[PDB]
Amino acid sequence: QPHIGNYRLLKTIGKGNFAKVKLARHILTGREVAIKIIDKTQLNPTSLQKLFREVRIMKILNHPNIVKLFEVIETEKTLYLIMEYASGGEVFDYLVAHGRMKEKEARSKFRQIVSAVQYCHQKRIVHRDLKAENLLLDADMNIKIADFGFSNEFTVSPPYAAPELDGPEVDVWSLGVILYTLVSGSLPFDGQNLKELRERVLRGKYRIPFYMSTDCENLLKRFLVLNPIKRGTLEQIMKDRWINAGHEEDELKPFVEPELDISDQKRIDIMVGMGYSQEEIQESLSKMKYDEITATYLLLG
Numbered sequence: 001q002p003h004i005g006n007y008r009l010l011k012t013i014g015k016g017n018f019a020k021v022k023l024a025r026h027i028l029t030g031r032e033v034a035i036k037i038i039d040k041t042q043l044n045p046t047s048l049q050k051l052f053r054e055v056r057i058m059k060i061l062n063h064p065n066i067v068k069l070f071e072v073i074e075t076e077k078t079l080y081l082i083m084e085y086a087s088g089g090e091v092f093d094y095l096v097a098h099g100r101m102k103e104k105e106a107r108s109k110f111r112q113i114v115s116a117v118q119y120c121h122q123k124r125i126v127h128r129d130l131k132a133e134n135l136l137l138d139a140d141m142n143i144k145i146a147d148f149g150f151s152n153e154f155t156v157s158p159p160y161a162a163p164e165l166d167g168p169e170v171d172v173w174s175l176g177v178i179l180y181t182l183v184s185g186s187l188p189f190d191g192q193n194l195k196e197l198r199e200r201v202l203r204g205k206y207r208i209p210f211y212m213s214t215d216c217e218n219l220l221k222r223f224l225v226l227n228p229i230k231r232g233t234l235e236q237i238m239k240d241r242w243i244n245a246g247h248e249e250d251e252l253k254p255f256v257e258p259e260l261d262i263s264d265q266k267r268i269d270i271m272v273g274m275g276y277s278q279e280e281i282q283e284s285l286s287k288m289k290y291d292e293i294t295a296t297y298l299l300l301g
């Protein structure tokens with residue numbers, strides 16, 4: 001029965017470069033979580049300084065459609081990042097299995113995605129690698145984007161990459177690719193090999209099928225521009241007609257984090273029952289430490 005801290009490990013769900021992701025169950029609350037495991041003996045002191053800077057950024061991202069950090073466990077040899085588990089898997093695999101989303105469903109998911117990316121851009125964080133593997137779905141079909149703020153070597157894509165491949169314009173291109181997959185069920189640029197795929201991206205031409213509206217085609221043009229300076233801004237794309245159809249009283253606007261309630265006495269009483277003292281509870285919550293206590297508090301809610 002392998003444990004990591006207060007977590008029971010169940011199975012691997014992702015791997016790449018220097019990272020591995022496992023599904024686990026929190027022993028104290030029974031809640032499923034995803035645990036990214038990074039072997040620090042696999043890194044140079046430059047890479048470790050990088051990892052720490054990027055963990056710090058992860059701690060400032062608090063958005064309902066961004067995979068949330070619950071707890072950090074660090075030993076001499078390993079860094080464990082305990083984060084939200086998205087039981088639905090990749091959006092891309094859901095589209096392959098079930099075909100395009102109709103524009104209503106696609107609009108609802110794309111509003112979540114634009115909100116998450118704009119919220120990060122507002123904090124001067126660019127993803128740089130939005131792709132199939134990090135657009136995930138939770139049990140209620142809400143989007144959860146993984147790996148914001150993380151360099152590639154700590155994560156587990158030619159079809160999504162802007163032609164000029166570090167600023168937000170790079171994400172805006174990817175968002176256009178993503179939008180096209182949601183409404184069509186297919187990628188806008190493909191090829192028989194990577195050389196042909198690259199050539200199609202640089203040509204910038206993609207097919208508008210019979211079922212896609214003018215308003216949807218017009219929206220795509222704000223993202224999928226070869227010149228990065230002529231790409232729309234996310235604060236600008238937020239006012240687009242397609243984006244807000246059926247949201248006439250509810251225009252998409254930059255997300256504002258809620259105030260964190262760290263004073264829920266029911267959850268604090270539960271955690272005293274678990275064996276934590278009132279004083280370590282109060283300190284961990286007030287300092288927002290991403291430790292075994294703050295994780296339990298969040299998982300209790």
Ligand SMILES: Brc1cnc(Nc2cccc(CN3CCOCC3)c2)nc1NCCc1cnc[nH]1
Binds near residue numbers: 015023087089090136
């Ligand atoms: Br962080 C993180 C948080 N949530 C997820 N959920 C996830 C990913 C892939 C598949 C599934 C669902 N299947 C079926 C049920 O049995 C579990 C596996 C859920 N993945 C996270 N990272 C890994 C990202 C990833 C992308 N392609 C593979 N892995």
